[PDB]
C-alpha cells in the first residue's frame, strides 16, 4: 500500500552491489541482470573500477543504458594520501564510470586533520566534474561514530564540492544508522545545499520497512519530492530482495 508505493520507489534509488563480490566478469554480468527488474531499473549498479568496461556493455546489451555505474577509489580505506585518491579517481574515470564514491579520510580528521578532507575531496571533484562524473563522498560515518565528526566530515566534504554524502563503505562493522542518515540529511539541510547535495544509505535498511523508515527522513526534512535518483540512494544488495518481495515478486 504505502509500503508498495516506498518499496517502488526505494527500488529505483539503489546503487545495486552484491553481499560476497561482483568482481568476477560473471558475477558483474550477473548484477547487470539483477538491476534490470520486472518493475523497474535501479539507479545504478556499484562495482569496482575494473569491472566497468564489461558492466557497460552488458547494460548495453540488455537494453538498459540508463542504469549508471557507480564505483568506488580511495576505498575501503580512506588513507589521506591524495596523489593515490586522485589517481584511482582518474583510472575510474577512465575506466567509464559515471559516478565515483571516494572515501574521506576519515580517521585523519579523527585525529584532528579537517584540511586534508578538503583538499582530498575537492581535488577527487575537480577531476570527476571535468569528465562529466559525479562524486559521492564515504564519511564512514560508522567509524567516525561521534555526531561532531559525521557533522564536521559531512560539512567538509559538501564545502569541497561533494555531489553526494553517501553514510559508508558496506565493509565495516557500522553502516548507515537512521541516526547518522539524518544527522547527515540535516548538514545538508543545514549548509542550505539540497539542490547540489544527495544523500547514500549504505547498509542498514535491510527491510522494504527499512527502506520506508530512511526515506521518511528524507520527507520529513525536505518533502516528498526531494528524493529522486540525483538526491538520493540505497547502497544495498539484500534489501532488494525484500524489496521485490513487498511488490510481489520473490
Not at 55 to 67: D, F, N, S, V
Not at 94 to 107: L, S
Not at 128 to 156: P, Q
Request: hydrophobic share 45%.
Amino acid at each position: 500500500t504505502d509500503l508498495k508505493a516506498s518499496s517502488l520507489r526505494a527500488l529505483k534509488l539503489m546503487d545495486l552491489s552484491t553481499l560476497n563480490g561482483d568482481y568476477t566478469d560473471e558475477k558483474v554480468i550477473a548484477l547487470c541482470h539483477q538491476a534490470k527488474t520486472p518493475v523497474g531499473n535501479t539507479a545504478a549498479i556499484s562495482i569496482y573500477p575494473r569491472s566497468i568496461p564489461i558492466a557497460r556493455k552488458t547494460l548495453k546489451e540488455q537494453g538498459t543504458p540508463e542504469i549508471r555505474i557507480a564505483t568506488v577509489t580511495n576505498f575501503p580505506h580512506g588513507n589521506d594520501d591524495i596523489e593515490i585518491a586522485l589517481a584511482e579517481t582518474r583510472a575510474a574515470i577512465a575506466y567509464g564510470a559515471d559516478e565515483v564514491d571516494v572515501v574521506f579520510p576519515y580517521r585523519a580528521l579523527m585525529a584532528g586533520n579537517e584540511q586534508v578532507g578538503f583538499d582530498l575531496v575537492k581535488a577527487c571533484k575537480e577531476a570527476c566534474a571535468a569528465a562529466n562524473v559525479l562524486l559521492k563522498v564515504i564519511i564512514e560515518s560508522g567509524e567516525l561514530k561521534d555526531e561532531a565528526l559525521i557533522r564536521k566530515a559531512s560539512e567538509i566534504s559538501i564545502k569541497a564540492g561533494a555531489d553526494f554524502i553517501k553514510t559508508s563503505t558496506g565493509l565495516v562493522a557500522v553502516n548507515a544508522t537512521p541516526e547518522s542518515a539524518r544527522i547527515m540529511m540535516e548538514v545538508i539541510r543545514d549548509m542550505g545545499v539540497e539542490k547540489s547535495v544527495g544523500f547514500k544509505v549504505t547498509g542498514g535498511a535491510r527491510t522494504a520497512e527499512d527502506a520506508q523508515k530512511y526515506l521518511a527522513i528524507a520527507d520529513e526534512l525536505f518533502g516528498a519530492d526531494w528524493a529522486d535518483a540525483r538526491h538520493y540512494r540505497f547502497g544495498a544488495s539484500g534489501l532488494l530482495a525484500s524489496l521485490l518481495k513487498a511488490l510481489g515478486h520473490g
